Write a protein that binds this DNA or RNA. Sequence first.
DNA 1: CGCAAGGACCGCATACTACAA
Lengths: 342, 345, 150, 149, 312
Amino acid sequence: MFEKAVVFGLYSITPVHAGSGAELSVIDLPIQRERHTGFPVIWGQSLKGVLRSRFRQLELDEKIEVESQKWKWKEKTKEVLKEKADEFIKKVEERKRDPLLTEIVFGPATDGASEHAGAVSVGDAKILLFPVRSAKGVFAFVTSPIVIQRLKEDFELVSEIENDIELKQILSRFKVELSNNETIAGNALILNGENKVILEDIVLKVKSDSNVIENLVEVLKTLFGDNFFGKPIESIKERIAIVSDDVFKSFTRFSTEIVARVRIDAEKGTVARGGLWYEEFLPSDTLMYSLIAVGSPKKENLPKEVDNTQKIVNVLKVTFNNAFLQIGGDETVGKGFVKVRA
Amino acid sequence: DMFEKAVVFGLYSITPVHAGSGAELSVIDLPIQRERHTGFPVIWGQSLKGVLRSRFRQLELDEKIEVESQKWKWKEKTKEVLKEKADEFIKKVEERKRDPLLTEIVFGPATDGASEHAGAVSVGDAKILLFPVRSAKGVFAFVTSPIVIQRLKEDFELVSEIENDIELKQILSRFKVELSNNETIAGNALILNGENKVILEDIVLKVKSDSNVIENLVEVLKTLFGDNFFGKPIESIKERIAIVSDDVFKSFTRFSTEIVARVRIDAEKGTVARGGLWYEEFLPSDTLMYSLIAVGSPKKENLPKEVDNTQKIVNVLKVTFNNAFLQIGGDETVGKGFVKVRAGV
Amino acid sequence: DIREIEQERASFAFKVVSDIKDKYSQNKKVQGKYSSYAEKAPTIILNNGLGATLAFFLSKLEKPIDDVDYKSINPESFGNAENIAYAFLYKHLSTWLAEGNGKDSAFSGLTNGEDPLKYIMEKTAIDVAISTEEALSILNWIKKFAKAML
Amino acid sequence: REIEQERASFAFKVVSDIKDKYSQNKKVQGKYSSYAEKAPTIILNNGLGATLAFFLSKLEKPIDDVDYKSINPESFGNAENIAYAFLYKHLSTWLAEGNGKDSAFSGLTNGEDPLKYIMEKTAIDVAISTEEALSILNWIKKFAKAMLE
Amino acid sequence: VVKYPVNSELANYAEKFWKKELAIYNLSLILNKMTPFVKRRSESYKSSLSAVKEIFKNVDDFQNFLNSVLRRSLDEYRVFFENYERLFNSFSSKIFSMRTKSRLVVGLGDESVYETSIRLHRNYGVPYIPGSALKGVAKHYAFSILARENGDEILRIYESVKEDLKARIAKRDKIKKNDVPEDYYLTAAVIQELFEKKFDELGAIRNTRVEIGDTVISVGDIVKIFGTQKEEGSVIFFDAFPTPEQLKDKPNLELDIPIFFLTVPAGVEFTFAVASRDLDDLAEKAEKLLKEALKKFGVGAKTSLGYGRFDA
DNA sequence: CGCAAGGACCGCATACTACAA
C-alpha cells in the first residue's frame, strides 16, 4: 500500500542525544549509529513515539485542526462508536486507550493491539547536512556524494507512490564525484589564498563545478519550503561544502560533541561515588530528514472527516509544520529541541 | 510537549567566570566550554540546573522559601502530602538521602528515587548574547553578531510557540542585518572622532550608516529585563552597542578572554612548587548571557495544593531568583564566578 | 593519501627539535634557553599579538623590524646563546608560517612564500588571526617535543 | 571474539607483570593503577599523537630519538617514571606487534614505532590505531583496577 | 623611530594617539596592543619601558599621561564599584578598607613584551588585587604563625612526614639526608605538606589554638575555613578594588627604578571583603587573619623590600 | 635569572516483556 508520502525535515535547535542501547566502550552514552556505515541516525521507533505523544496531547486539548473544524474527541467518539462509545470514554479517562483520531492514525494502544494496524509509517531519519568548523568563515555545512545518492534513492521510492517523474529528473540532474580530497565549496568558505579550503584539521583543494551545489540548493527549495527552516536559503547557499565519502565519514565520528558530567555531594563540596561520566551529543544545526508514508486507513468505521489518504496527509501536514519537537533523552537540560518542516 | 509557560533568564557577570571543560594539553591548561562547530563560548544547561537545584534546596532547608507569601516548611508541608509515609520521607531527607519536598516536586526526584517520576523544569543552554570588548574611544563595548540575533529569533519563536502568543515573533520579525566583513553598525559613543571609524582591539574598520536596528535590539532588552541592564540605565547600553560580522566576532571570542598565570609557591624554597605553574582562562566581566527555562505541569502524585498549576511554579521561580546573585563555575572561594540573574516573560 | 595538518605539525616539530640536539649537543645552555623560549612564547602571542612577538624576536636579534627575510637568517651567526636560541626559534616559526611542512606535503604554509612579518603588515585582520592560530598550534607541538627530548 | 580474548589475555599479562615488579611496594602499584585509569580520558580530548607525546615528555631522561623498544621501566628512577614507562611500553607493544606473529592480532603498526608510524602514514591508519588503543585501554583499566594494589 | 609592528592603518592611528593627540581611554588597550617600539639611534628597535619613557618628553610627562588615561574612566569605574558593593552586601560579607604602607606591585612576573607588567583590570585599567593572592597570603601567614609558636609539637607529632620531607629536600638539593636542618623553614614545609594530600592525620594535632591577633583559632578551624582537598572551604576571598574617590585627585600609578616599572603609590586606599558560604561564623576569624597578614607580611612581589605592607 | 600542574572520581540505581494469535 502506502499510497501517499510526506517528507519530514528536522533542524536541531539544541544539541540532540538519542540514547543508544547498552552503555559500553569508552564513551558512556553514545548516539545511535549504524554498524553498516557509521553515520549518525535516528531510528524510526523514537520518532513515531514522540510524534504519537505530541499528537495525542494536542488532540486532548481539541487544538487539532481537522479540516479547520477543531474535532472533539468525546463528540466524534460518541458519533462514531455510538452505544459503546461511552465505555471507551471511560477507558480514555483512565489513560488506558487513546482518543479516536490518534488511535486511527498511529494505531491503537497496547491493550487494544488486535483491531487495526497504524495507518502511518515513519522511516529512519538520515543525515543530510553536518556542521563542521572551518578556518575562513565559520560553521560550514558539509555533505558527501553518498548522501545525495541515498537522497536520489528516496526520491525514486517516493516516485513509486505518487509518480513524481519531475522530482526524479531533478534529482538525476545532479551527479558529482570528488575523488580523494578536493571539495566543492561555496564562496564564503574559500580561503583568501589560492583555493585551499581548510576544514577542521584537513587542508583541501576547491573544485570549479559549483553549479551542482546550486542545483542542490534548488532541491532544498523544492523540498523544505522557501526559507531554510527560518533563514534565507540563499544565505545558506554560500556556506555548503561537498567532500569525499571517507572524509565525511571521518567528520561524522570525530566531530560530535563530547561532554563530561559529574554529581556534587550534598555537603562535601566535591564529586561523589559514581559521579563522573561522559556523553556524546549530536551538534546543533544538523539537518536530518526522513520519509513518512501513509496507506489505507484500516480502522473499522472511520469518521467521514478523515476517511481517505489525502485527508490524513492534509491533517499531518497542517498539524506538523514549522512546529517544535522534543527528541530523545536529557529533556530537562535543554537537549533535543528541533524544528520540523514538512 | 508538556510545557506551557517559559521564562527567559539573563545572566550578567560581575566577576570573571570559568565553566570548567576538563584539562587539555594545549597552551591554556584550563579552558572553557565551547560549542565544537561554532567555537563560541557557552554554558551548558546541566551546570545551570545543578546550581539552581542546589540554591533551591539550600533556601528550602532554611525555610526561607516564600511560596504565596508563606514559608514552605520541609517537615510540615510534606506531612500533609505524604501522609503516613511522611515520617519515612522526613528521616530520609534529614539523612541527605532525598531532596526536600519542594525541590523534589520542582526539579524532579533525587538520585535515590530517580525512577519515581519526572521533573517540571527544562532549563536550557546559555548562548552568548553580548561580549564586552575593549574599545579605543569610549570604553567596553557590547559586541554581538548576526548569528546571535538569528539564534535569538529562533528562541523567541520557540517561546511564542509555547505561550501561543505571536507578540514575540512580531517583535523580533524586524531583525535583518547584512553586515560586511569590515563594517559595523556602531553606536554613537564608540565612534572614534574622525572618518566614522572604530578601533576595536586590533581591528579598525569603517562604520556602515544604518538605524532602526540597534534601537530594536535595545527594545528587546526592555521587554524582559525590566528597564535597567543589570541595574545600569539602558540608555548607556543603547549608546554603547556595536554589531560586527561573524568572522571578526569569532576572532574576538578567541583572543579577548582573561588569561591568568596562577602558581603555588612552596614554603621551603619560597618561590614555586615543582610543577606549580599553569594558565587559566576566564570569561570577562560584564558579559551578557541568556538562557531559556520551560515549565510544565507537575508530575508527582498527590502534590500539595499550593503547587498544582504551572503558573504557580513559574511565579515561585520568578519570585525566588529575580535580581539574585548566584555562583557559577569553579573557583567559587577564590572569587571567580559570580553573576546577577534576571527573569522575565 | 590524505594527512591532516596534525601529522605534518608533529613531523615538522620533530624535524627542528631533533635538528637542534645533533647540532648543539654540547651546548646544554643553548638547549635550555631554547626550551624556555618555546615555553614562554605562546603567552606573549596571546597577550600582545603575533606581529608583536615577531618584532620582539627581531629586537633581541638586533635587526631592523621593518624589512625581514627569514630565509636569510643563519642561526649560526649569533654568538650569544640567548641570541642563537632566539634566531633558531624565529627561523622555525617563520619557516612554518611560510612553507609549512612543505610544498609536497598537505600543508604548505599560509603566506605562500612570503615573510610572515610582511604578511601581517599588509593583510586584513582575518588572515592575521588564522596565522596566529597556526603559530599557536605549532608552538604547542614544538614545546611538547622540546620538553620531551631536549 | 578472538581479538577480545587476545586483548583480555594481554591485559592480564601486563597487569601481572606490573604486579611482579615492586609487588610489596604499594607506591608503584597505586600509581600505575591511577595512570591506566586516567589515560583513556586524554586520548578522547587530544588524540593519540598528543597522548604519546605527553607520555614521552613525562619520562625524565634525554630520551634521544624515539623508540617503543628500549627504555627499560626499571631503569627509571622515580616510581611515577617507572609506571609511566611501563604504560608506554605496554601500549606501544600492543600497537606494534600485539601478541606475536601467530596471535590473532599481529598489531596494526607492523612492528613499527607507534609515534613514527603516526608521523609518516595516512589519516585512516591513525584512526584505526586510535580506536584499537582505546579498546585495549578500556580492558586494561578494569584488569589493573581489579587485582593491582 | 617609533615604527609599530601592526598593520599600517592601525600603525598610523596608534602613532597619532601616542603623541598626546587623541583620547584613547582603555590604558590596557594602549599598553598591550599598540606597543611603541623605539629604535633610538645606534641601536635596534628595543621595546623596554626605558625606551618608552625616552619617547615621552619626561618621566613626569609619561606619568601624567598614564594618570590621565586611567582617570578618564571614572564614571564607569564608579558604576562598577556600586555594583560590586551591592554584591558584597547581598552575600552578607564583612568588608573593610586599608591603605598601602609603601609602593605595591602585584604580578610583576606576568609575561609581556615589556620586561614588566601589572595585573591591570581588562575593562577599566585600574590596578586591583585578586582574591587568590589574598587566600594564598592568608594561608602562608597562618602556616608561619603556627610553625613559629608550636614548632616542636608539630615536628614531633608527624615524624614520618618530617623524615620524608627531609629526604625529598636532600634529593632535590643533592645533599645528605641528615644534612637538612630542622629550621623553621623545614617546619613550614612539613605543615604545608600536612595541609596537602596527607591531611587525614592533621586531626591528631587538631588542638593547638594559635593566637591570631587577639583571638585563639584552632587548627580545625583553619581546615574548616581555608578548605581542604576533600572539602570545599567556607570562606570566600573576594578581590580588592581601589576606591574611585582617591583616584579622583591622587594619582594611582607611579614609576619606579635604567629598569623601570609601574607601581601603586603609598597611601592608596583598597577595600577588601570576606564572606562565609556556609553557616560557620569563621568569617570574623578569617577577617582578623587577613588583616594581620596584610599588616605583617603583605601581598605583592618583592615583598622583602617593604612592598605590599598595609596599615590600618 | 630562572621556574614549566597533580592528584582525587572513572556510571551509578531501576526498568529488565506483555497480551493475543
